[PDB]
Amino acid sequence: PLESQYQVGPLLGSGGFGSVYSGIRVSDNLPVAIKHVEKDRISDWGELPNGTRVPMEVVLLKKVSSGFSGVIRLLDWFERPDSFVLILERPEPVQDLFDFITERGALQEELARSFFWQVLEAVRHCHNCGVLHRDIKDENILIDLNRGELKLIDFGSGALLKDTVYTDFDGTRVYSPPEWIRYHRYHGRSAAVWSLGILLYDMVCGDIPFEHDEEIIRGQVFFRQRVSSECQHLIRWCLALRPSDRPTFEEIQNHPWMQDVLLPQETAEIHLH
């Protein structure tokens, strides 16, 4: 460990959140991403089964990294004097959803349907594993361009899923629900559905629906691109002001706009290749 086990490549991206390098596992040489995070920058911590002090991100990643390909899996991790190092899967070739939408503009609804469906399946997986992502957005989704498969990343703002109120939030504000803006309170699943509404709008419109707090609070959705009545309805449902008025995940996936989704590979062949 650890420079011995991997050859570090170019820096891929950086924030106060962390620094992520492209890497190869020597002995594979499996493509990986190497994420470094300073201990001083870590807000919430968790406990490992073996009884260890560890960043919450690691706890959450472990609970979700069991082979379902909808989430980027944690392959290994290391503690260093002033930081933790995470070894993550790296698809190749890859592009995040933010850059993809930026290049292509608003997505055709057939493509948005396929992508949105996969994100839903990924989020359902997380919730099933007792994990709430809390920062669902285009920048946090990778596209395996060859397979047409979407992968969730960055559990740095996440939490253990619970049925009681959350009173903290460190995800992206423009994706945060009106109940957070107004009361500093939200529940996990209904807040997630709100962010999914924002994500879906962004996909079919090429930009997010709200920029300011008062716009989020007002909750009026204006469409800047041509979008079918069905898709508009689903979006509006997801962005209901009252959390209890939002659809469940079952209701979203049973929505008429969500029917007859393409398989990931079909999606790649038609829209990606």
Ligand SMILES: O=C(Nc1c[nH]c2ncc(-c3ccccc3F)cc12)c1cnn2ccc(NC[C@H]3CCNC[C@@H]3F)nc12
């Ligand atoms: O798991 C994470 N990243 C990754 C795991 N596996 C990957 N493979 C390819 C890439 C990748 C992204 C963008 C361009 C080329 C790439 F090979 C990122 C990751 C991750 C978790 N938290 N986090 C926080 C920041 C960050 N930075 C990468 C960003 C670069 C700008 N686009 C959004 C990405 F998240 N990455 C992460």
